[PDB]
C-alpha cells in the first residue's frame, strides 16, 4: 500500500535547478508502469535504418497508452509526488494552463499531441532527454481541426503535383472565437510534418477512397440519369478496419474550475479531473 516517487537530483547545476523550478508548473509525463522510463525516448528513434525513423505513430500510441502525473515543490533532502492513476486519489490538483486555445468548463475534453508546426518542449544539454507536452482539445473541435488539416494538405499536394496553380480564393479563412484570432496555412515553407510522417497515411486513405468509389461506381448506381478480383477488396477492408481501430477515442479528461475566470490564457489556475 505504498506509492512511487520520482528521483531527486541532489547537488545539481544552478542552471539546471533554475530550469527545473521554472518548468515545475508544466505538466510532466508519467514514467513506465513497472520500474522506470529513462531510455525509452532514446531507443524510440534508434531504428533509423538509413532514413527518417517513423516516430509520430509510436509517440501517439505511447501518449494514448500512458497516463500523466503531477509534480510538487522541490525540497533539498526529501521529495514528494502525487499520482492519481493507479495509486490513491488526491483532494484537488493544480496544473497551469498549457493549451492556448480557449476552453469551456462542463464539457468533455480530449488529449492529442500536435504534430504540425512546432510544440512547446523542454530540453537540457547535459541531460539529452526531451519531453513533448500534448495539447488538450475537445473532440468535436479536434475532429474539425484534423479534417481541415487533411483538406489543406490534400490541396497543397494537388497544387504541387499539378504544376499549374489550382488554389481558388473562397473567402476569408480566419477563425475567431472569444476575441482570439487563429490563422491556418499562413505559410508554405519549413513544412517538416506536412508530408513527412502522415504522408503514407493520407496516401493510403486516398487510394482506399479511390478504389472504393471505383468499385461502387462500377455497378451500384442504376437510377442515375484467373483473377477472383477479391484480394484487393479484402485488403481494403482490412486496412479500413485497422485505421478505424487505431483512430482511438481518448475521452477521459475533463475541466472543472470552481468560480474560475471567464477568459482562459496560458498561466492561469485550472484543475485536472477525470470521469
Amino acid at each position: 500500500p505504498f506509492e512511487i516517487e520520482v528521483l531527486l537530483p541532489g547537488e545539481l547545476s544552478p542552471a539546471e535547478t533554475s530550469a527545473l523550478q521554472k518548468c515545475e508548473g508544466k505538466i510532466i509525463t508519467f514514467s513506465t508502469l513497472r520500474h522506470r522510463a529513462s531510455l525509452v525516448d532514446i531507443a524510440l528513434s534508434s531504428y533509423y535504418i538509413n532514413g527518417a525513423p517513423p516516430d509520430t505513430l509510436s509517440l501517439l500510441e505511447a501518449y494514448r497508452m500512458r497516463f500523466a502525473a503531477v509534480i510538487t515543490r522541490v525540497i533539498p533532502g526529501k521529495l514528494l509526488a502525487h499520482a492519481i492513476g493507479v495509486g490513491t486519489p488526491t483532494p484537488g490538483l493544480f496544473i497551469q494552463n498549457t493549451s492556448p486555445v480557449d476552453l469551456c468548463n462542463g464539457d468533455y475534453i480530449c488529449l492529442l499531441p500536435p504534430v504540425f508546426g512546432s510544440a512547446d518542449s523542454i530540453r537540457l544539454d547535459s541531460v539529452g532527454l526531451e519531453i513533448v507536452f500534448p495539447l488538450t482539445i475537445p473532440q468535436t473541435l479536434m475532429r474539425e481541426i484534423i479534417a481541415k488539416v487533411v483538406a489543406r494538405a490534400v490541396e497543397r499536394t494537388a497544387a504541387g503535383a499539378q504544376i499549374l496553380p489550382h488554389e481558388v480564393l473562397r473567402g476569408a479563412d480566419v477563425i475567431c472565437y472569444n476575441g482570439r484570432r487563429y490563422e491556418l496555412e499562413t505559410n508554405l515553407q519549413h513544412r517538416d510534418g506536412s508530408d513527412a510522417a502522415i504522408r503514407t497515411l493520407v496516401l493510403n486513405l486516398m487510394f482506399s477512397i479511390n478504389e472504393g468509389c471505383l468499385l461502387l461506381l462500377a455497378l451500384i448506381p442504376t437510377l442515375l440519369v484467373r483473377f477472383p478480383i477479391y484480394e484487393t477488396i479484402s485488403s481494403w477492408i482490412s486496412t479500413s478496419s485497422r485505421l478505424g481501430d487505431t483512430l482511438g477515442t481518448r475521452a477521459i479528461l475533463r475541466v472543472c474550475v470552481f468560480d474560475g475566470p471567464s477568459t482562459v490564457h496560458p498561466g492561469d489556475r485550472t484543475a485536472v479531473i477525470q470521469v
Binding site: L80, H82, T90, P91
Partner: protein, 305 residues
C-alpha cells in the same frame, strides 16, 4: 434558534399626536391604520485554502519518534492559529464596516423634509400651494450649490442649522428605549462617523472634551427556549417569543456636550482600514447637465442702439 420566521414583526401600541381645534366641526371619532414592513437578510462566507503538506505531517502519529516532526507540527499549528486569528479579525472588520449605512437612500433628511415642516401645515396642498412649493424647491436647488462650503470660514451657521433641525426632530419610542447612560445622567443620541480632518477641525473649533466615562457592559447573554414552548410552537409552525407584557477588553470612550444635544464622534482612519482591499465607504456621486445655444439671434430689429 431560528429556521423559518417569515419576516416576523414585533407588536407595539404607538399613537401619533394630533392637533385640537374644537372650532366649527362636530364631534368625531379617532381613526387608526395598521401597516406592515419587511425584514431583509444578509450573509457572509469565508474560506482558507491549504495544501496537503499540513495533513501529511499531521497524519504521521509519531512514525519516526523524534523532535523534528514535533517542531514541524507545533509550527504548523501556530501558523494555522495565526491564520484563524487573522481571518477572524478581517471578518470582524468587514462586519463593522458593513454595519454602517442601511438607509443611505433616505439618509439626507434636510432637502426632503425642510419644506414639509416649513410650508405644509398638514400635508394637504391645493394647486397654488403645490406651485409655490415647487417654486421654492427649484429656488433652493438653484441657489444652494456649494454656499456652505464657500462660507465655511464663518463659524456662525451652526446656530441656524440647529434652529432649522429642531423643527424636524421627533421623539423616539418609549417602550423599547433601553440604553446605557453616563455618570452625569444624560442619554446619548447616536454614533457619528466622519473623516479625520473634519473631526480634528470640529475638535479645534467647537467640540471641547469635558467627560471621561467608558464601559463595555455585557448584558445580552444567551437566551434559551424551554422544550414545552419549542414543541408547542413547532406543532403549528408559528414561533412565539416574549410573553412578558402582562399589562475582558477595554476601549477608550468619551462624550461631549454641545448644549441640548449629546452626540459623540468616533473616527478611526488609521486604526482600521489599513492595507485593506476594501475601498473607503461613503463615496457618493452626482450628475448634472448643461445646455448651450448655437447660432441664435433676436427676432426684432430695433435693439442695436
Amino acid at each position: 434558534e431560528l429556521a423559518y420566521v417569515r419576516d416576523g414583526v414585533i407588536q407595539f401600541e404607538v399613537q401619533q399626536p394630533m392637533i385640537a381645534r374644537d372650532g366649527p366641526h362636530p364631534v368625531d371619532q379617532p381613526v387608526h391604520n395598521y401597516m406592515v414592513k419587511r425584514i431583509h437578510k444578509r450573509s457572509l462566507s469565508a474560506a482558507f485554502a491549504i495544501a496537503s503538506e499540513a495533513l501529511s505531517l499531521l497524519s504521521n502519529t509519531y512514525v519516526d519518534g523524534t523532535e523534528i516532526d514535533s517542531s514541524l507540527r507545533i509550527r504548523a499549528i501556530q501558523q494555522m492559529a495565526r491564520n484563524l486569528r487573522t481571518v477572524l479579525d478581517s471578518f470582524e472588520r468587514g462586519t463593522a464596516d458593513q454595519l454602517l449605512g442601511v438607509l443611505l437612500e433616505k439618509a439626507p433628511p434636510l432637502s426632503l423634509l425642510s419644506p414639509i415642516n416649513k410650508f405644509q401645515p398638514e400635508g394637504h396642498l391645493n394647486r397654488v400651494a403645490r406651485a409655490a412649493l415647487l417654486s421654492d424647491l427649484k429656488r433652493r436647488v438653484c441657489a444652494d450649490m456649494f454656499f456652505m462650503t464657500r462660507h465655511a470660514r464663518e463659524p456662525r451657521l451652526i446656530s441656524a442649522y440647529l434652529s432649522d433641525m429642531v423643527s424636524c426632530t421627533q421623539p423616539s419610542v418609549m417602550v423599547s428605549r433601553i440604553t446605557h447612560t453616563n455618570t452625569r445622567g444624560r442619554q446619548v443620541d447616536g454614533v457619528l462617523v466622519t473623516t479625520a480632518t473634519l473631526k480634528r477641525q470640529l475638535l479645534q473649533g467647537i467640540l471641547q472634551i469635558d467627560d471621561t466615562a467608558a464601559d463595555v457592559p455585557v448584558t445580552y447573554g444567551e437566551m434559551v427556549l424551554q422544550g414545552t414552548n419549542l414543541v408547542t410552537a413547532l406543532v403549528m409552525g408559528k414561533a412565539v417569543r416574549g410573553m412578558d407584557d402582562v399589562a475582558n477588553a477595554r476601549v477608550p470612550a468619551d462624550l461631549v456636550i454641545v448644549g441640548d444635544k449629546l452626540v459623540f464622534l468616533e473616527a478611526l482612519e488609521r486604526r482600521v482600514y489599513q492595507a485593506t482591499r476594501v475601498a473607503y465607504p461613503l463615496i457618493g456621486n452626482i450628475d448634472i447637465t448643461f445646455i448651450m445655444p448655437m447660432g441664435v439671434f433676436q427676432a426684432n430689429s430695433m435693439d442695436r442702439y
